[PDB]
């Protein structure tokens, strides 16, 4: 769905994360590789060691993307349609993967920002992650 409480909680958090998005994206990748190794599968051209510049660089990209979305919450499908094609048509990605990164991305936010990690916000983002993921998986469905 995505009601206007939601959308508020989401904006406000992303405002507060501001200039750090780019590192949070770095880290959430980290955590993902490290807690769910099956995912490194998709990055064989990556230096998948811990502070590596390969990881860091994407991270910035994965977080720009989410920034972009945060701006088009009404038109998530327009907003991310090229990435939709990327992950579905070209990278051929297991949908289970998104559940996993979504969880590490949530985590990284809870680490950095405990105070605005109230349960009400937690729910809202979750929900945001689930929506973004549905979108990148939509070409399967």
């Amino acid at each position: 769905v995505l009601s206007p409480a939601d959308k508020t909680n989401i904006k406000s958090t992303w405002d507060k994360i501001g200039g750090h998005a780019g590192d949070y994206g770095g880290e959430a990748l980290d955590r993902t590789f490290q807690s769910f190794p099956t995912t490194k599968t998709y990055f064989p051209h990556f230096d998948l060691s811990p502070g590596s510049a390969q990881v860091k660089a994407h991270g910035k990209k994965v977080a720009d993307a989410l920034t972009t979305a945060v701006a088009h919450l009404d038109d998530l499908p327009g907003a991310l349609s090229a990435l939709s094609d990327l992950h579905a048509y070209k990278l051929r990605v297991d949908p289970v993967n998104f559940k996993l990164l979504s969880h590490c991305l949530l985590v990284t936010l809870a680490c950095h920002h405990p105070t605005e990690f109230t349960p009400a916000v937690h729910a809202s983002l979750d929900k945001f992650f689930a929506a973004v993921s549905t979108v990148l998986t939509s070409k399967y469905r």
């Binding site: 807690s35 590490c104 985590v107 680490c111 405990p114 990690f117 937690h122 729910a123």
Partner: protein, 146 residues
């Protein structure tokens, strides 16, 4: 569950610092809130209809506690999880009929509440070990369906 020595030192290292009255409460609360369907197993618990309602409800604090104590029990016995949870496993499966996918999800929200609580000390290192233990528990509990 493997859990190499390093991993063990890191798990039990953090778990020393965890306020067990608190965290059961928050983990469980959070479940009801982010996955609303889970509420159907707690009708007995009274008003859960709003987030502050759940945050504030006593029966929930009081379980949270019981759930997190049992997770304590599984930390001692990391070896034979299977044994430690089997009796509990028969309850979630038979008398309760909880689909196991929901074990996961408690497990993950617990990883959440930790992270929120421990800030940086929750390194990718640390969270990997708990992912492990968490996944262990959820299987150990699923057992009576295997």
């Amino acid at each position: 569950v493997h859990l190499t020595a390093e991993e063990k030192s890191l798990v039990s290292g953090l778990w020393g610092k965890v306020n067990v009255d608190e965290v059961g409460g928050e983990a469980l609360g959070r479940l009801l809130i982010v996955y609303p369907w889970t509420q159907r197993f707690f009708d007995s618990f009274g008003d859960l209809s709003t987030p502050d309602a759940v945050m504030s409800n006593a029966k929930v604090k009081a379980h949270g506690k019981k759930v997190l104590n049992s997770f304590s029990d599984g930390l001692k016995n990391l070896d034979n999880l299977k044994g430690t949870f089997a009796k509990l496993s028969e309850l979630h499966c038979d008398k309760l009929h909880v689909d196991p996918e929901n074990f996961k999800l408690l497990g993950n929200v617990l990883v959440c509440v930790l992270a929120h609580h421990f800030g940086k000390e929750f390194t990718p290192q640390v969270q990997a070990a708990y992912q492990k233990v968490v996944a262990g528990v959820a299987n150990a509990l699923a057992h009576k369906y295997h």
